Design a binder for these strands. Sequence first.
DNA 1: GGTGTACAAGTATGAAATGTCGTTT
DNA 2: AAACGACATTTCATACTTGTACACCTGATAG
DNA 3: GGTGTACAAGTATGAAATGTCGTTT
DNA 4: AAACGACATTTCATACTTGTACACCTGATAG
Lengths: 342, 342
Amino acid sequence: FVPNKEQTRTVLIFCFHLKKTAAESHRMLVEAFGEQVPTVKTCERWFQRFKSGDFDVDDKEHGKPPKRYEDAELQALLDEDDAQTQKQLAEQLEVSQQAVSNRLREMGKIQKVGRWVPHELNERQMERRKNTCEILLSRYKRKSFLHRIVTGDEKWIFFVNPKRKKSYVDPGQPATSTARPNRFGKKTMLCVWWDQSGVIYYELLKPGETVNAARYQQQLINLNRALQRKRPEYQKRQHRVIFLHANAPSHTARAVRDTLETLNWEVLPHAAYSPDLAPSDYHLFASMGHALAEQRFDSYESVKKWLDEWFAAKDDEFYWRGIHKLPERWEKCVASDGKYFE
Amino acid sequence: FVPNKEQTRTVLIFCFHLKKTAAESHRMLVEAFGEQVPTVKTCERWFQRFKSGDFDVDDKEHGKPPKRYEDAELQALLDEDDAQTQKQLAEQLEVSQQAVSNRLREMGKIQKVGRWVPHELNERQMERRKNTCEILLSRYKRKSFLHRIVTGDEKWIFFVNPKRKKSYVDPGQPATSTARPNRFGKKTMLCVWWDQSGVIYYELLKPGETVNAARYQQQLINLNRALQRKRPEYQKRQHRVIFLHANAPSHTARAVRDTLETLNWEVLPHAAYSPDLAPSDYHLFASMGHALAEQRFDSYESVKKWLDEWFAAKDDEFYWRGIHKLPERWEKCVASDGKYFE
DNA sequence: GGTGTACAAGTATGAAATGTCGTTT
DNA sequence: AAACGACATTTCATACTTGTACACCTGATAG
DNA sequence: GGTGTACAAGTATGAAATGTCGTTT
DNA sequence: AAACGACATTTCATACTTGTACACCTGATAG
């Protein structure tokens, strides 16, 4: 009925503690469970190991084939090139693909996708960015000027922004498919300026309408009006407002370049290809990106009506937080020697 | 000092098979290991179970808490909408998100991202496809004409095709990042026509150049001329040519529409928004897509050279299979009611 | 910048499994 | 002694909870 | 259909574990 | 007898190998 290599050795422990002999136990063993029991020679050996003081009922580790390549030998490949295929590594290790699968899960390794990054910068752009951030930081060290900062940027809002569905289902079964987004589709073109205390002023352009040097100039003033009545502490300190914006063509034309001299603001330095230093981009629009995902607008009216609901829901401190992230981002901008950071 | 619930119960199997008494075994037990051993009452019990026949060393299933929901309750949720989040399913079951993660592993379930499908068809756009397939089948069934088929479309070839990187590394470590593709970067349009016996004629337009109804007209002759050299069997059968091409605007302007009548080619019916019935798309370009991935070009020259080598590498079997995938795709087209099929 | 999924550690369930101790064999 | 019979007291997977780690998402740019 | 990963069986490793003997406590 | 030394035989978790199964890619549209 009840033999078992593990159970048998347990019985040998029991006999040995009762102080019975090796051979005697082997007779009691055969008396209980019949002939199929082991030899006395093993009982003697097991007893031998008990006299040593080692009551482990499991085997010691058997012999095994030699490793065809070392763990640190694989890691050396990944050091030079983070991202290769299993079959690419397997090929370099004179081994099969699935062997490499195993070693990878055996080591601490997982597969995670790379980050997209805005642009392929040169040493040129990197030095500019680095220096700008170096400059903006040193000033913040002396005097914290973020309370004075007002920023804005412009962002397309598509009427239909479908996200790919991801469904929970039994293997081999098809998941829910979604229709692709046709680039040439209805899209308003939100323009928005804001500060640490909230959103100041925004214009949602009509389908297809955009921003030329004339339209922007007209916006800067429409802003300053709404800014005067929204921010009391401004009318006196009309020269103390710090303006942060993108280096677009309509953001440099004479007609506008002028309008900022007459408004008498301080245009903040903003390096080339630097969305990661642009509050509106990394914080405001980022947040929005989520809220917009798989959201569907039929008419401009609903878009403008959605914007308003959104902007309102947001607490003042959300925007505050976005602005007061500039310092830490500058600390990374510099630390990374001008490259993009996480 | 080697007691253990499993081991101890194993010892009572031994004493029992040595036809000793319950209170006997107990004494030997306390004699062997020490006072840290079960009471006689338990030995009396375990003996009872050895008389029924059962020698199960492990316990029977203990008391356990009641299931808050059921496995088919959750499956109902997935049957109506299979692509919810765990929190969303949890919410409906008055249970935590985590509690759902598990039950989903417990059941056979895995998460998988759905497929992109090129457009959102409406009933009219659907039935159009269904009908055009229905008809093309009914003809094929009668007589195979794919041998006469000669299709062709056009496709952009960016000079830089960057693809997101996938690295192997320890949890919480950065992966190899990639600089985004420049929408308005160098690209050459490729215009190519082919048939089951292989590529017939192609033109690689220069950076920025585009097909205008006049150009397409010219192209159709250059094709035709190139066609009768490469395909002998059309000198004789000069009206047998079947022509499958996209419903573009250049492909309908009268200047062209005449040219096709003067050449006297049977133009094949093609439904709108149906690149999944267009060999040039779903087969010939689909292949390139992989071959192009992570490939970089520097000059118009480099691309032209690569194309050739690629067209040569392709054995004639390839071109044949793409064309004769038609009847399959039609038959699925019509079966899915004009909807897209995977 | 926000969200989704799956690890890690705590609580409570509740039928085994177990100690007590006078009673029956 | 030897084993039961009721009645009390501890085990321990289990079906959840909460806390937390962390992939991967979101915004881009300039023209 | 193309490419990449991971599951499922199959196969030889090779030191332990076990057996078989003629020896010595 | 009861246990040891050699010397020959069987185990069994490994480290790999084919075959798969199967997730996700890749081509888009028309104005």
